[PDB]
Amino acid sequence: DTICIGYHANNSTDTVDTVLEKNVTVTHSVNLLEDNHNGKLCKLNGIAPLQLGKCNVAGWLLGNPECDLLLTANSWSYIIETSNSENGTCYPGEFIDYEELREQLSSVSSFERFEIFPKASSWPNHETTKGVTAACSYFGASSFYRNLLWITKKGTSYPKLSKSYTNNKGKEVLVLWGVHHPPTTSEQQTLYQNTDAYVSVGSSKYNRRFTPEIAARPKVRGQAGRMNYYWTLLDQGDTITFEATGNLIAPWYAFALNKGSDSGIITSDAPVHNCDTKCQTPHGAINSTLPFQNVHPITIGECPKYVKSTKLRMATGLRNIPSI
Amino acid sequence: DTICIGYHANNSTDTVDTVLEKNVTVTHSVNLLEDNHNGKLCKLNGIAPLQLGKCNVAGWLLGNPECDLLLTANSWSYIIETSNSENGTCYPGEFIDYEELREQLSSVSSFERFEIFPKASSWPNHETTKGVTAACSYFGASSFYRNLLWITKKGTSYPKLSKSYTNNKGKEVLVLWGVHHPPTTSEQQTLYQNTDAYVSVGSSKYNRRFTPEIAARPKVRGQAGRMNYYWTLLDQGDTITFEATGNLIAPWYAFALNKGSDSGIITSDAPVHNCDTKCQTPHGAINSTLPFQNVHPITIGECPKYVKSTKLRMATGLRNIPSI
Amino acid sequence: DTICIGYHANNSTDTVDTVLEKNVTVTHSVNLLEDNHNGKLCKLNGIAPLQLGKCNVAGWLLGNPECDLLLTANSWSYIIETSNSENGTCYPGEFIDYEELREQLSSVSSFERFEIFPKASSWPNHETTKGVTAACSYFGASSFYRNLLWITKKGTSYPKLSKSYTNNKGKEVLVLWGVHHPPTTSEQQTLYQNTDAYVSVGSSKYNRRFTPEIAARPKVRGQAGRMNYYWTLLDQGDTITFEATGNLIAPWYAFALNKGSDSGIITSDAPVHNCDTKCQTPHGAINSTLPFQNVHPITIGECPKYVKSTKLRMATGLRNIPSI
Amino acid sequence: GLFGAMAGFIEGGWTGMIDGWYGYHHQNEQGSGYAADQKSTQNAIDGITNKVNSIIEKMNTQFTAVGKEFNNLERRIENLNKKVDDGFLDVWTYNAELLVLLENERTLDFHDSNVRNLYEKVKSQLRNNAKEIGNGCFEFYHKCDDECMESVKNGTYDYP
Amino acid sequence: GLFGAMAGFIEGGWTGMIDGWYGYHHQNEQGSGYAADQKSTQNAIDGITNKVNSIIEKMNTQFTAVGKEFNNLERRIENLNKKVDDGFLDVWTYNAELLVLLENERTLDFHDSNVRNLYEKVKSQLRNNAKEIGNGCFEFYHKCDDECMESVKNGTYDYP
Amino acid sequence: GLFGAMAGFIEGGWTGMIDGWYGYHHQNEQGSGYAADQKSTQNAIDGITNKVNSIIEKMNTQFTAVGKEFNNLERRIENLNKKVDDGFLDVWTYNAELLVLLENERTLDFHDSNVRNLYEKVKSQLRNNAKEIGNGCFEFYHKCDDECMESVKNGTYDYP
Ligand SMILES: CC(=O)N[C@@H]1[C@@H](O[C@@H]2O[C@H](CO)[C@H](O)[C@H](O[C@]3(C(=O)O)C[C@H](O)[C@@H](NC(C)=O)[C@H]([C@H](O)[C@H](O)CO)O3)[C@H]2O)[C@H](O)[C@@H](CO)O[C@H]1O
Ligand SMILES: CC(=O)N[C@@H]1[C@@H](O[C@@H]2O[C@H](CO)[C@H](O)[C@H](O[C@]3(C(=O)O)C[C@H](O)[C@@H](NC(C)=O)[C@H]([C@H](O)[C@H](O)CO)O3)[C@H]2O)[C@H](O)[C@@H](CO)O[C@H]1O
Ligand SMILES: CC(=O)N[C@@H]1[C@@H](O[C@@H]2O[C@H](CO)[C@H](O)[C@H](O[C@]3(C(=O)O)C[C@H](O)[C@@H](NC(C)=O)[C@H]([C@H](O)[C@H](O)CO)O3)[C@H]2O)[C@H](O)[C@@H](CO)O[C@H]1O
Ligand SMILES: *[C@H]1O[C@H](CO)[C@@H](O[C@H]2O[C@H](CO)[C@@H](O)[C@H](O)[C@H]2NC(C)=O)[C@H](O)[C@H]1NC(C)=O
Ligand SMILES: *[C@H]1O[C@H](CO)[C@@H](O[C@H]2O[C@H](CO)[C@@H](O)[C@H](O)[C@H]2NC(C)=O)[C@H](O)[C@H]1NC(C)=O
Ligand SMILES: *[C@H]1O[C@H](CO)[C@@H](O[C@H]2O[C@H](CO)[C@@H](O)[C@H](O)[C@H]2NC(C)=O)[C@H](O)[C@H]1NC(C)=O
Ligand SMILES: *[C@@H]1O[C@H](CO)[C@@H](O)[C@H](O)[C@H]1NC(C)=O
Ligand SMILES: *[C@@H]1O[C@H](CO)[C@@H](O)[C@H](O)[C@H]1NC(C)=O
Ligand SMILES: *[C@@H]1O[C@H](CO)[C@@H](O)[C@H](O)[C@H]1NC(C)=O
Ligand SMILES: *[C@@H]1O[C@H](CO)[C@@H](O)[C@H](O)[C@H]1NC(C)=O
Ligand SMILES: *[C@@H]1O[C@H](CO)[C@@H](O)[C@H](O)[C@H]1NC(C)=O
Ligand SMILES: *[C@@H]1O[C@H](CO)[C@@H](O)[C@H](O)[C@H]1NC(C)=O
């Protein structure tokens, strides 16, 4: 008659590491390292993302001709650019504070695209039908952005224009515009007459006054000319005022957005599916259950802390020493 | 005859948590989480803070009419704005690098307010008595900042002015000034005559040259005009030079400050009392004895690391298992 | 007959600290705190650093007269300024985005200095021999930077110049230039005739157009004039274009650099020797074997994490209790 | 281990015992078999369970988007941002790595400790009515039928 | 616990013993009472004291002002600053939280270990001159008056 | 220590034993001497070795240049950069400091545990054929020549 007190053992081959010994086979372990995704761009917390495909942020907002599908854009929790996101500012120039606008518009709740300055209506005494370029070609034909309007000279006279919009949308309004910069001081006149032209944007929170910066420079994707794009968020009840003797690429359409917080811009060619997630990465969504992850340093949401490790297995059972 | 070796027990109900079991009653514990303050704005290391009350930083430094009490400001270790700090740039415009100046002036050791360009004395051939606005109303009457002086046209002639101050204060000197921007090109003359007016500030460390940016824009708290405020720290022995054909809101008073390090700006409506502290927060002072705190993420001084936890009790005695 | 099981002991006086007791003498310990260097500026990973000595970054790149030895500069892994690095922009002015250029040029792989706009050749109808200043004196004689060329007025006529360089170097090209700012509107003409002079730099990635900002200002190390230095990295195949009616301090020599990653600028007077290292500090190189270091907060390379501690000795053997 | 039971004086485990972590294996004239000590097993379960939960649940996470986007003239703050990321990404790597190494050691020791306390629990009851065969077993100097075997398991063993 | 003394083979503590953490309670024909073992108590005090001090004193702190203030066109570096704060504020939360959990476990085990070593200290001296009643007690096979009781307490117990 | 061997029931160590960490010292009619228990010594070596390696090797490091360089109008992001540096420089200080304190405690306990398990290993074999002199020694009730002494060392001691 005998009795022995002993311990469990099984066919487990899970191994963990301890400060004293590497690879110790244990009966039962638990993984604390999220290292697999669903290779899909999911919805981040109920709301789906915004796909841009061939277009990029600047192209989407400016109204590039190749971004016709993005004209419905509504809601979204984060933006998605792809390795093909190349249709942007078809007409060369610099998009002032672009990165900044990109970040500020990552997550929007409400976002309506309205016509702030109607083409056929506003801009009297000014040419509004020749404002097209081969740089922004729509189906072979020369076109231009769809939210901006290229106002030129009326016959042989470009008089001072001065129109103003006042935000009664009950929410911020993104007002985008541009200032054109001819290469020559000869073109400055053939287009806006007044050689000493200027443009000025007023608001109870904006006052910069531009002038055209003519200068010889390399032709880009077509023109030697240049167009700087500007934006600003017009507060409720505030009134923005535009006036210019030339060189103004006036706002045509603006957006009555409604952002709450801020997320970011994922850039991947992973398929967008109707799944959900608290944590989204460029390769796919992650599971926010474990405390660590090695799927990708760049994530959006409530994510596991990114670590360089490949194995963080925690022992739960005991040393596995079978053999009966 | 018997002897037993055992352990202590008492009426303690303190509970701690262990990796293996939650809420274990122990005989004696120690708290490592500072979670209570004195709801008072104390002095941070000997020196008291600077209260601004109804005024805010821009209002204090510019000389807003509602900030008469702040004209004595001396020493201070950190600045205090309140939910009423609203009297600032009574006259609309943009305060260039405001945040930057705010941070750089958080902690000052020596700070004297002197008259750099005496009103009654300097500015000959120029009007120095009409420089008042209803935007900066002092007791119903129209006034203006107390450290800046609004130089206008002398009758029907505004000639070139060109005065310069050289820092012999044996310490930095904060020189604040402004450039006025009329809405019309008509006002630009009714006030500074010269339509192509300009302003230029020179120093062995500054050289920007401004011009007025007339442009139609919304009226703010009164005027459709705008005033950009500028500042700069003039090194010992250096000489700043002002000259302008118009639109200059010349320095009247400057400050011979003496900053050593930098703290910050607490913004709270908590009472300021003559207590001291190594760590100060918006809700009150904290005790810097423990290693962690949950009173507030935003602190100033040598503070306990802020954590989201609500309970960090450490066991010191043993498991409490009484019952005799 | 007896047997006793016991433990080792020796003459060790190493002491370690434990959560329960301070300074415990152990038989054998291990140090985990790198606290000694070789007081030498070594080579960071095969490639040696760049010494500037009396010259500083701005002086080196601009072509200051006192930096003749730095005209060979080749390869380098990190730059070294000393407490004597003072010969920089001998001619007063502001070096736009200086810190930025400093950081971007910390580590270069390939870097050739070529003559982008040959002095004797380019600039016809313009004076290219009087462009010298006493501020940049070379051996008593008045000189000027060696990479820039001070173009002035030809007799009594300074016509519009317009030259352009196109990068066919098969790698980036650092193009440095300057815009001169006279104190008076009288000097603006005695030097560049045209009072309303301007300068404009074009590229498929640059379009700013400058004008001289005349303004009275303190004389610095000689002149009351001022020269702003500008730079830009011209991409392969892109073409930069310069044109100006005056005030342009044209590029003479440019650099066909080839940077891969970025390091930094060590500033120390420690001797540079032909040693190597994965981690370099201002006081000397560190050993990257241990996990922590207290030699210096500022390091370059793969370094041990900097800590405020002075002693991190880990026990490996046991408590040392000798005495036979 | 730290307590010398696992792979110690009680080298090797039992494939046979399938209803727990620690337990017994008796052998009397009536038959034999394995039986996990239910309490110590349940407790160890609860603790390890609680330990895992703590390590997992104590991890706080703010909703955030790591990426930043800076232009060719914001290299310095880009590198700063880089420093922050590699900074935290280096802290959590050293932690996650060691937290596990150190905790795994603890857990193993925990089990080992549990086995030794169970062994010692029995060795207590029996005492002289059994001889210790230094392999985690006891050989009753008397007859111990199933009621007796049960007795020692539920800690109610008679006159020692 | 890890050493099986607290709530283990010596379940429950003594409200009566009021002059220490670990100690004894004798009972002979002369009378009874509690008496904390002064050394082990003092030592445990010193160590825990030192442990707390370490956890507290090892915390370095630079004089700093967390807040920053950025304008509507510095959102990116504002978020960066945000990332840094939530970043450290997340590191110290996971640490403070676990440091305590893990250290508390240690401290309890420490005490448990101290009790077991004291028990074992006595069980050593007595040996055969007493029987072990598996409850943390010893019953002298002989008479042990107060001098004798003191003897075993100050570790000077005679012929075992 | 935590296991009561070092500076515990086996106070003081042996300058004499020079071929290991833990071991024995016999004394029979033939002569005397020290002899480190080779296995437990080798193992302890391996583990501590592995422990040090882990603490060292688990430290990740990205090639980076800490310094930044900001101008008089970038004070805010300079302070931000400052915050990041003091931030990490404060995390690693509290860690390095405690990691060592806590691990040192562990290592000492490890050794102490090893000594106690070795002692207990012998006390097991001998049992009745030796008396325990509470100082880490055993006095054979019989004659134990060198072959016998070796026997108990290599764990092959006869009829107990
Ligand atoms: C075959 C060919 O290349 N075209 C030759 C003509 O070149 C013209 O050169 C001018 C520059 O002065 C412009 O680049 C012309 O292109 C447009 C464009 O953007 O596509 C034409 C647009 O209609 C025009 N937009 C406006 C204002 O209506 C646009 C703008 O003028 C510029 O962008 C302003 O910077 O330019 C281009 O066609 C050349 O003029 C002609 C001479 O007879 O010969 C053609 O072969
Ligand atoms: C009742 C009423 O609203 N006033 C009417 C007059 O309006 C004037 O409009 C001008 C704009 O051209 C200014 O806003 C006038 O206000 C001041 C101000 O700031 O308060 C008056 C100040 O004296 C003046 N400061 C100076 C330079 O001395 C200031 C400046 O001019 C501007 O700030 C420059 O931008 O303007 C305001 O009173 C209106 O002119 C008059 C016509 O007869 O009718 C009034 O009812
Ligand atoms: C002894 C002495 O100090 N010189 C007196 C002359 O002063 C001249 O003042 C002018 C300012 O108008 C300049 O500073 C002159 O210095 C130079 C310089 O930089 O060294 C001379 C250079 O040759 C010139 N460079 C050029 C364009 O060729 C340079 C530039 O003009 C300025 O930097 C432009 O901003 O100035 C300095 O010598 C004084 O003119 C003379 C009157 O007869 O008396 C001298 O004693
Ligand atoms: C938008 O982007 C596309 C590319 O993503 C532009 O097309 C480019 O790619 C062509 C080949 O597909 C190349 O030939 C050119 O580099 C370029 N343009 C041409 C000639 O197609 C496209 O033009 C852009 N459209 C707009 C209006 O932005
Ligand atoms: C300074 O700030 C106060 C408010 O903090 C200004 O007063 C404002 O508040 C009034 C009610 O108290 C409102 O009617 C207005 O919005 C506004 N101005 C008026 C009409 O009082 C006060 O004017 C400011 N003073 C100065 C000179 O800056
Ligand atoms: C470069 O720097 C040196 C100093 O590092 C300049 O010399 C300065 O130091 C002189 C004494 O050594 C002082 O007298 C002056 O402050 C100053 N200039 C003089 C008069 O030597 C030197 O001039 C500079 N050279 C250039 C061309 O940059
Ligand atoms: C391990 O053993 C279990 C016991 O039932 C069995 O279900 C499983 O298939 C086995 N798997 C392996 C690892 O062989
Ligand atoms: C374990 O064995 C060694 C580490 O000593 C390693 O090379 C091997 O890949 C490990 N395998 C496991 C269990 O992951
Ligand atoms: C706890 O007991 C102590 C013992 O003196 C006594 O002073 C105190 O009032 C009691 N408090 C509680 C928690 O009942
Ligand atoms: C302890 O009990 C539970 C945790 O298991 C919790 O709900 C309760 O609030 C805790 N109370 C204490 C001691 O703070
Ligand atoms: C310590 O003892 C060793 C043993 O050989 C000897 O080599 C060394 O010189 C001694 N050093 C000290 C610390 O006295
Ligand atoms: C150890 O002793 C005390 C700490 O209690 C300290 O003052 C002394 O400097 C220490 N010396 C050593 C071993 O570094």
Neighbours, chain A (3 or more CB pairs < 8 A): B, C, D, E, F
Q: Nearest-5° angle of CA B208, CA B210, CA B212? A: 170
Boundaries of every domain in chain A: 1-41+274-324, 42-273
CB contact under 8 A, D10 and A290: no
CA distance E109 to chain C (A): 13
**Proportion of chain B in helix, strand, coil states, percent, rounded to 5:** 10, 40, 55
Residue B145 has phi, psi (to 5 degrees) of -55, 155
Residue A86 has phi, psi (to 5 degrees) of -125, -15
Q: Cα–chain-centroid distance for residue A209?
A: 27
Rg of chain B, C-alpha, whole Å: 29
How would DSSP label each residue in B65-105?
A: GGGGGGGS----SSEEE-TT--BS-SS-S-BTTHHHHHHHT
Separation CA A316–CA D47 (nearest Å)? 10
Separation CA A97–CA E14 (nearest Å)? 72
Residue C157 near residue C124 (C-beta atoms within 8 A)? no
Tokens 């080749």 correspond to C74
To 10 degrees, what angle do helices F75-126 and F146-153 make? 140
Neighbours, chain B (3 or more CB pairs < 8 A): A, C, D, E, F
Residue C253 near residue C63 (C-beta atoms within 8 A)? yes
Separation CA A271–CA A49 (nearest Å)? 12
Residue F25 near residue F12 (C-beta atoms within 8 A)? no
Alpha helix ranges (H) inside chain B: 57-62, 98-104, 187-192
Residue F142: other Cβ atoms inside 10 A = 9
Pairing mode of beta strands B292-293, B305-306: parallel
Which of B82, B46, B45, B78 has the alpha carbon at shortest distance from B262?
B78
Residue A175: other Cβ atoms inside 10 A = 24
Give the pair of three-digit tokens for residue F146.
């060198």
Q: What is the DSSP letter of C20?
A: S
Separation CA A23–CA A19 (nearest Å)? 11
What residues of chain E lie within 8 A of the CB of F93, using their CB?
A: 58, 60
Cα-based distances in Å from F119 to A266, C40, F23, F111, F128: 63, 53, 9, 12, 15
How would DSSP label each residue in E36-71?
A: E-HHHHHHHHHHHHHHHHHHHHT-----EE------
Give the pair of three-digit tokens for residue B315.
């066991």
Separation CA A235–CA A251 (nearest Å)? 17
Q: What is the DSSP letter of C67?
A: G
Q: What is the DSSP letter of A304?
A: P
User: Which residue does chain A place closest to E75, by CA atoms?
Assistant: A100
CATH for C1-41+274-324 is 2.10.77.10
Separation CA A155–CA C200 (nearest Å)? 30
- Judged by a CB distance cut-off of 8 A, whether residue B22 touches chain D is yes
E strand or H helix at C95: none
In the three-class reduction of DSSP (H, G, I as helix; E, B as strand; rest coil), residue D129 is classed as coil
N residues, chain A: 324
Q: List residues bridging with F22 in a β-sheet.
A: C7
Residue B208 near residue B201 (C-beta atoms within 8 A)? yes
User: Which residue does chain A place closest to C198, by CA atoms?
Assistant: A215
Strand order of the sheet with strand E64-65?
A: B285-286, B279-280, B300-301, E64-65
Alpha helix ranges (H) inside B159-290: 187-192
Separation CA E37–CA E153 (nearest Å)? 7
Q: What is the DSSP letter of B14?
A: -
Q: List residues bridging with E22 in a β-sheet.
A: B7
Residue C56 has phi, psi (to 5 degrees) of -120, 175
Chain A residues with at least one Cβ partner in B under 8 Å:
162, 164, 200-204, 206-209, 238-239, 241, 243
Boundaries of every domain in chain F: 1-160
Q: What is the DSSP letter of A231?
A: E
In the three-class reduction of DSSP (H, G, I as helix; E, B as strand; rest coil), residue A5 is classed as strand
Q: How far apart are the first and last CA of chain A?
A: 21
Q: List residues bridging with A230 in a β-sheet.
A: A177
Separation CA B179–CA A195 (nearest Å)? 27
Buried b (16+ CB within 10 A) or exposed e, C254-277: bbbbebeebbbbbbbebeeeeeeb
Which of C176, C194, C177 has the alpha carbon at shortest distance from C185?
C194
User: Which residue does chain A place closest to B223, by CA atoms?
Assistant: A204
Separation CA F21–CA C319 (nearest Å)? 11
Q: Which residues contact B140 (CB under 8 A, 6 or more apart)?
A: none
Residue type, B36: N
Separation CA E12–CA E5 (nearest Å)? 10
Separation CA A40–CA A38 (nearest Å)? 5
Q: What is the DSSP letter of E79?
A: H
Rounded (10°) CA dihedral B135, B136, B140, B143: -120
As to burial, measured by CB atoms within 10 angstroms (0-12 exposed, 13-18 middle, 19+ buried), residue B196 is exposed
Residue type, B252: W
Whose C-alpha lies nearest to ligand 5, atom 17?
B221
Which of B167, B207, B240 best probes binding to C when mutated, by most C CB atoms within 10 angstroms? B207
Separation CA C80–CA F67 (nearest Å)? 13
Residue F120: other Cβ atoms inside 10 A = 15
Separation CA E2–CA E111 (nearest Å)? 10
Residue B180 near residue B142 (C-beta atoms within 8 A)? no
Which of D84, D96, D90 has the alpha carbon at shortest distance from D58?
D96
Q: Nearest-5° angle of CA C213, CA C217, CA C221? A: 110
Residue C126 near residue C230 (C-beta atoms within 8 A)? no
Separation CA B220–CA E5 (nearest Å)? 78
Residue F46 has phi, psi (to 5 degrees) of -50, -50
Mutate to test the pocket of ligand 8, among A12, A22, A25, A312 (most ligand atoms within 8 A of CB): A22
Which of C195, C180, C72, C102 has the alpha carbon at shortest distance from C135?
C180
Give the pair of three-digit tokens for residue F84.
């990041």
Give the pair of three-digit tokens for residue F17.
């034993």
Separation CA C297–CA B181 (nearest Å)? 48
Which of F38, F33, F40 has the alpha carbon at shortest distance from F14?
F33
Residue type, D98: L
Separation CA E125–CA E134 (nearest Å)? 17
Q: Which residues contact F154 (CB under 8 A, 6 or more apart)?
A: none
Residue type, D140: F
Which of B322, B317, B273, B251 has the alpha carbon at shortest distance from B15?
B317
Give the pair of three-digit tokens for residue A102.
């990109």
As to burial, measured by CB atoms within 10 angstroms (0-12 exposed, 13-18 middle, 19+ buried), residue A311 is middle
Q: Which residues contact B219 (CB under 8 A, 6 or more apart)?
A: none
Separation CA F127–CA F160 (nearest Å)? 6
Question: How many B/F residue pairs have CB atoms within 8 Å?
Answer: 14
Separation CA C145–CA C149 (nearest Å)? 7
Q: What is the DSSP letter of E24?
A: E
Q: List residues bridging with C206 in a β-sheet.
A: C203
Class of domain E1-160: alpha beta
What residues of chain C lie within 8 A of the CB of B243, using their CB?
A: 215-216
Buried b (16+ CB within 10 A) or exposed e, F37-57: beebbebbeebbebbbebbbe
Strand order of the sheet with strand B79-81?
A: B50-53, B79-81, B265-267
- The answer, yes or no, to whether any atom of ligand 8 lies below 6 A from the CB of A310, is no
Q: What is the DSSP letter of A85?
A: -
Residue D129 near residue D94 (C-beta atoms within 8 A)? no
Q: List residues bridging with C128 in a β-sheet.
A: none
Residue B318 near residue B27 (C-beta atoms within 8 A)? yes
Q: Cα–chain-centroid distance for residue F85?
A: 35
As to burial, measured by CB atoms within 10 angstroms (0-12 exposed, 13-18 middle, 19+ buried), residue E127 is middle
Whose C-alpha lies nearest to ligand 3, atom 30?
C133
Atom of ligand 4 nearest to the CA of A143: 27
Separation CA F160–CA A106 (nearest Å)? 79
Residue C185: other Cβ atoms inside 10 A = 11
Class of domain C42-273: alpha beta
Cα-based distances in Å from B141 to B59, B133, B134, B152, C276: 18, 9, 7, 19, 74
In the three-class reduction of DSSP (H, G, I as helix; E, B as strand; rest coil), residue E61 is classed as coil
Separation CA E98–CA D55 (nearest Å)? 8
Q: Which residues contact F84 (CB under 8 A, 6 or more apart)?
A: D80, D83, D84, D87, E84
Residue A4 near residue D138 (C-beta atoms within 8 A)? yes
Instruction: Please report the sign of the dihedral spanned by the C-alpha atoms of residue C289, residue C290, residue C294, residue C297.
Output: positive
Separation CA A79–CA A280 (nearest Å)? 12
Residue C279 has phi, psi (to 5 degrees) of -135, 125
Resolution of this PDB entry, in A? 3.0
